[PDB]
Amino acid sequence: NLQALAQLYKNALLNDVLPFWENHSLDSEGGYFTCLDRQGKVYDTDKFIWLQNRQVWTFSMLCNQLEKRENWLKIARNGAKFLAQHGRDDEGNWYFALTRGGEPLVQPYNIFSDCFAAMAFSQYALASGEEWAKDVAMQAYNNVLRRKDRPMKALAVPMILANLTLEMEWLLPQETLENVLAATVQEVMGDFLDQEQGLMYENVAPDGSHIDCFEGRLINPGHGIEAMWFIMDIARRKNDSKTINQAVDVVLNILNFAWDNEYGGLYYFMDAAGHPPQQLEWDQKLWWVHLESLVALAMGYRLTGRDACWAWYQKMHDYSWQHFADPEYGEWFGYLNRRGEVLLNLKGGKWKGCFHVPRAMYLCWQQFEALS
Amino acid sequence: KNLQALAQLYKNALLNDVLPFWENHSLDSEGGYFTCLDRQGKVYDTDKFIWLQNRQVWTFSMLCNQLEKRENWLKIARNGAKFLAQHGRDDEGNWYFALTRGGEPLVQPYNIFSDCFAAMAFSQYALASGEEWAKDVAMQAYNNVLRRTRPMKALAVPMILANLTLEMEWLLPQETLENVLAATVQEVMGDFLDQEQGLMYENVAPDGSHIDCFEGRLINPGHGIEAMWFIMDIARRKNDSKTINQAVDVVLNILNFAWDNEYGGLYYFMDAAGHPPQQLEWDQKLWWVHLESLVALAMGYRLTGRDACWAWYQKMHDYSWQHFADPEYGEWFGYLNRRGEVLLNLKGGKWKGCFHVPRAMYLCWQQFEALS
C-alpha cells in the first residue's frame, strides 16, 4: 500500500543513501569523492564541481525541508568551504573540475557550473545563516544572468533557469520567481512540447519549430519526464489543473513511446524520425531516467488521482528497484546496458553523485505521504 | 514496540484530526478565531482570548516553517495575525488579554506574558509569510518584554523567556540565544529543581531556597515535566548528554510522585508538605499535563534510550488516549475529574485552544520517526 511505499522511500533515503555518502565520500582535504566503486571505495580523487555543488545542495536542502541535522550541516559546510576556496577563477567564474587538492583542470567554461553553485550556496546559506555563503550564491546567480544570453535552443536551458530561480527563492523578490516560473511553463509546454507526437523535444529553433538534424530529432525520454514533474510542481503553486493534467498527458506519452518492450526500461536516447541516433549509449538503462519517472508518476497520481499514473508507477517501480537498487552495499547503480545488466561497477563517477537518487527518494517519500 | 505505528498514529492525529478541527470550527469571518468550542466544535462564546489567538497564529506558522508551507495554514495564520495587529495592543503598544469578537478591549491588569506570546506568534508568522509588517509587530512585542516581604519567583518566567528567545531565533544574534539558553538551564535545573527530592517547584525564593507558604509548597507535576522536555531540547543542541539525562531523571521522579494509583493519571497540583492545597482543582486530570508527559517520555527515550522512559510511555499513552481522545468529534477533551470523567464538555475555552494538542502531536510524531 501507499503507506508502505512512503516508508520504503523514507528508509532508503535516511538509512541507506545518505549514510552511503557520509560513510564513503567525505574527503578530509575538503569536498567529496564521487568516483566510488560498488563498495564505496574511491577509484579517482578528482573533484567534479557540478557534483560537488549538487552534494552541498542535497544535504542543505534536507536541513531546510526536514531538520537542521548537525551531521548534514557539517557535511554541506565542508563541501561549501572547499568550493568557495577553489571553485572559481579570479573573476569569480566557476570551474568544471579540480584535482583532489583543488587545482583547476582547464577546459571550456560552461555557465551550468555557476547555476549549480548558486543553487548549492543559496540552500547552504539558508540552512546555516552564514553570510559568506550568501555572497557566493548571489555572485554565481549574477554570473548566470550576465552570461546566459542553424540557431537552436536546448530544453535544459529553461529547466536550469527555473531551477536556479526557485533554489534562489528566499533571496529574490516574489515577482522574479513569478515571472520566471510563468515564462518557463509557456516555453517548455509551448516550444519544447511537440503537439504532433505529444513528446518533448530536446532541441528546437528559437521560434519553437523543428530542425531536421541530429540535435533537432533528439528525444531524451527521462529528461522530458523530469521537466514534466517540474512543470507539475510549478502549476501546483497556482492550482493550475489544466497544466498539471497536460504534463501528466506528456509523461504517459513518453513512457509509452520509450519503454523497451523486449527488456523493460526506458531508452536513454531516441530519434524522433526513427533514424540511427548519433549516441552510442542510446539503448542504455540509466538510474536517473527511471528515478525521475518514479517521481513524475507518483506526483502525477498524487495531484490528479489518475489511475493510469498509478498503473505506470507500479510498472516503473518493479523494474527500477529490481535493476538499480543495491541494498547489500548501499545506493543504486547508475549504468545498465539495454538488457539491464550492470555496465559499470560504480555508485558514483563524473556524472553520478549525491543528487538524483537522494532527491528522488525524498520526493517520492513526500508524494506517498500525501497519498497515504 | 512498533515505533512506526506510533509515528503514524500521531502524524495522522495531527493532520487528519486536530488541524482540520481548528480549520473546520474556529475561523471567525470577522478575524481571529473562536476558541470557545463545545464537544462538537459549536461556538459557545465569541470572546477573543489573546494568548490563545496568538498561540494559534504560532501553531499554523510553526507548521509552515517546520513541515510544509501549505496555502491553507498560511491563510489561517494570516487572518489571525491581521486581526491581532489591528486590535490586540493598547495605545502604549502593550498587548491585551482579551477582546470581544469584533476586537474591542476587555479590561484587566496588564500581563507581560501577553507580549511574550505575541512576539512568538508574529516572529513565526513573519518567517512563514516573509511579511515585513509582521516582523515589526514581533520586534515591538519582544522589545516591550525586554524593557520590563517574601520575594519569590515563578518557574513560568525562565520557561517563557527561553521560549520567547527561541521562537525569535531568526531575528536575533546567535549569541543572545546561546546566553538565554545557558541561563535557562542553570536556573531551571539549579534553582527550581530541588536536588534532595529530585522534584520541580513552581515558586522559590530569588536565591533558590524554599518558602513555607501556599506558593512555595506548590508542585504542578505537568508543568515541571513540560520544563524538563524543554531542557532536554536545549541540551541536545550541544549534545549535553549529562543534562538530558538529569532531566529524564526528574521526569521519572515526578511521574512516580504524581501518578494517581487509584484512578490513573497525574494530579494537577500537589502540596510538597502534604498539606491541603489552596487549589480546588488539585486532583483533576488535564489534557496538557498528560500530553506534555507523552512528549517528555517519547523525547527522553529518543534521546537517551532509557528503558524506563518507554515503560512509562506505554502507561501514559494508554491512560491519555483512552481518557482525552474524542475521535468521533475531533480533538481532545481538556478537563476530566480525578476519576477521568469528562468535567467540562468543551474542546476549547479561555485556556484551551490550538496549542498544546497540535504541538504535542507534532512533537511525538517526530520522536517516533527518529526512534523508528
Side-chain angles (χ1 to χ4, degrees), chain A residues 3 7 10 65-67 70 128 236-237 239 302 369 372, chain B residues 4 8 11 66-68 71 174 236-237 239 302 369 372:
Chain A
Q3 199 173 120
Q7 177 75 210
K10 179 172 62 186
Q65 306 266 9
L66 287 177
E67 198 181 18
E70 163 185 339
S128 62
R236 94 98 110 211
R237 292 168 61 87
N239 296 304
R302 187 261 186 92
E369 288 292 10
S372 182
Chain B
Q4 190 49 226
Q8 179 63 221
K11 179 173 65 192
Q66 300 283 52
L67 260 190
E68 198 201 336
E71 153 188 331
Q174 286 169 152
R236 81 169 310 194
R237 300 167 58 88
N239 305 304
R302 177 263 184 92
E369 293 283 8
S372 170

Side-chain angles (χ1 to χ4, degrees), chain B residues 281-297:
Chain B
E281 70 270 40
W282 75 265
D283 69 347
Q284 294 176 21
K285 308 290 171 62
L286 270 73
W287 80 115
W288 73 258
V289 165
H290 302 78
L291 285 166
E292 305 300 340
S293 294
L294 288 170
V295 174
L297 291 157

Side-chain angles (χ1 to χ4, degrees), chain A residues 31-325:
Chain A
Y32 315 112
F33 299 122
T34 61
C35 289
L36 302 180
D37 72 10
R38 181 186 182 193
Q39 286 74 46
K41 174 178 202 202
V42 176
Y43 67 81
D44 195 301
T45 61
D46 277 359
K47 298 291 177 57
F48 300 107
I49 293 273
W50 292 13
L51 288 184
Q52 299 292 305
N53 279 302
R54 298 297 207 178
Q55 184 160 167
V56 171
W57 176 86
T58 293
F59 283 94
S60 299
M61 162 291 276
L62 284 174
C63 286
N64 296 329
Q65 306 266 9
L66 287 177
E67 198 181 18
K68 277 167 185 183
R69 298 252 277 265
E70 163 185 339
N71 69 147
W72 302 348
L73 284 169
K74 177 191 187 196
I75 291 163
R77 188 187 201 268
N78 288 332
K81 281 221 297 104
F82 174 77
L83 291 175
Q85 174 172 186
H86 302 289
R88 300 170 285 180
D89 67 18
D90 279 335
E91 311 109 77
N93 301 310
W94 282 80
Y95 291 115
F96 172 77
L98 313 170
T99 252
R100 175 188 180 184
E103 291 183 274
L105 293 166
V106 61
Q107 52 214 111
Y109 276 116
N110 188 319
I111 197 54
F112 286 169
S113 334
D114 304 70
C115 299
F116 306 140
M119 296 179 209
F121 283 80
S122 172
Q123 287 299 308
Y124 176 71
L126 184 55
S128 62
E130 297 188 81
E131 183 90 4
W132 64 267
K134 178 189 171 279
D135 287 341
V136 168
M138 307 293 335
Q139 177 191 56
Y141 176 68
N142 290 310
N143 287 349
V144 173
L145 294 189
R146 49 187 163 246
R147 287 196 185 285
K148 69 186 193 77
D149 295 320
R150 207 204 276 295
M152 87 200 335
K153 55 182 195 168
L155 206 214
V157 178
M159 289 182 59
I160 201 181
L161 173 71
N163 275 111
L164 213 201
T165 313
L166 204 51
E167 295 312 314
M168 287 293 294
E169 172 173 16
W170 74 288
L171 289 176
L172 302 180
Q174 293 183 66
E175 149 168 345
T176 296
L177 195 48
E178 291 317 335
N179 294 342
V180 170
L181 299 186
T184 303
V185 172
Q186 193 296 310
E187 183 177 16
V188 166
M189 301 309 278
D191 293 349
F192 289 93
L193 208 198
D194 157 58
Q195 294 301 316
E196 181 61 38
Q197 272 180 286
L199 294 178
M200 294 301 292
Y201 277 61
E202 294 297 294
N203 298 286
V204 302
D207 71 346
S209 66
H210 292 347
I211 310 172
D212 183 358
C213 62
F214 280 114
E215 297 87 354
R217 293 186 303 272
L218 174 53
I219 308 306
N220 182 336
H223 192 37
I225 288 170
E226 187 181 27
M228 290 309 92
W229 76 248
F230 195 83
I231 298 294
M232 292 180 210
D233 194 64
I234 293 171
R236 94 98 110 211
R237 292 168 61 87
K238 276 178 199 310
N239 296 304
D240 177 4
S241 278
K242 172 158 171 103
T243 296
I244 295 167
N245 282 288
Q246 181 190 11
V248 171
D249 285 349
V250 176
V251 170
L252 299 165
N253 295 341
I254 305 172
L255 289 175
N256 288 324
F257 184 73
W259 185 262
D260 177 348
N261 288 301
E262 170 153 18
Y263 300 111
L266 304 173
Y267 295 121
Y268 191 9
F269 293 107
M270 298 178 81
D271 177 289
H275 303 320
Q278 69 172 142
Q279 290 82 9
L280 294 177
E281 67 266 49
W282 73 268
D283 74 349
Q284 300 186 8
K285 306 294 165 62
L286 267 79
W287 86 112
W288 71 263
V289 163
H290 303 267
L291 282 165
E292 302 301 348
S293 298
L294 298 171
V295 175
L297 290 163
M299 206 177 117
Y301 184 52
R302 187 261 186 92
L303 286 172
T304 71
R306 283 208 254 165
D307 294 358
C309 289
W310 175 236
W312 259 113
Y313 175 87
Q314 302 168 76
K315 188 174 190 182
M316 189 58 60
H317 175 110
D318 283 342
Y319 176 84
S320 305
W321 282 88
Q322 298 180 8
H323 300 264
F324 297 98

Side-chain angles (χ1 to χ4, degrees), chain B residues 122-138:
Chain B
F122 281 81
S123 172
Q124 289 292 310
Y125 179 63
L127 187 51
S129 75
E131 294 206 89
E132 198 62 27
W133 71 260
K135 180 177 170 302
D136 294 342
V137 176

